[PDB]
């Protein structure tokens, strides 16, 4: 069979992964505005988000793109 380590168990095919955490759906999450983004899902605590931002939101993995982005 298979033992169920009490301490800490590794990932599982139970559910698909989205956020970099490489974990299943959990906690507060958001949807990346970028239509190209494959994940389009990240955890708040991870995306330094305290509340649900109104309008559009771009993950910290897309916005940081090498382009004409000047400031
Ligand atoms: Zn995460
Ligand atoms: Zn994104």
Obtained via which technique?
NMR
Q: What is the DSSP string of 39-59?
A: ---EETTTTT-SS--SS----
* Residue 29, H or E segment: strand 29-30
Known binding residues for Zn(2+)? 19, 21, 32, 37, 43, 46, 59, 62
Residue 1: both structure tokens together: 């069979």
What protein residues have CB closer than 5 angstroms to ion ligand 1?
19, 21, 43, 46
Other C-beta atoms lying within 10 Å of the C-beta of residue 4: 6
Tokens 């906690």 correspond to 27
What protein residues have CB closer than 5 angstroms to ion ligand 2?
32, 34, 37, 59, 62
Q: Do residues 26 and 44 lie in contact, with contact meaning Cβ atoms separated by under 8 Å?
A: no
CATH of 1-71, picked from 3.90.1720.10, 3.30.40.10, 1.20.1600.10, 3.60.10.10, is 3.30.40.10
Residue 20: both structure tokens together: 């970099």
Residues 6+ apart with CB under 8 A from 36: 62
Tokens 């305290």 correspond to 50
Tell me the three state secondary structure of residue 30.
strand
């Amino acid at each position: 069979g298979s033992s169920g380590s009490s301490g800490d168990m590794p990932v599982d095919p139970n559910e698909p992964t989205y956020c970099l955490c490489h974990q299943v759906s959990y906690g507060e999450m958001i949807g990346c505005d970028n239509p190209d983004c494959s994940i389009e899902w990240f955890h708040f605590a991870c995306v330094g988000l305290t509340t649900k931002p109104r309008g559009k939101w771009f993950c910290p993995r897309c916005s940081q793109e090498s382009g004409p982005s000047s400031g």
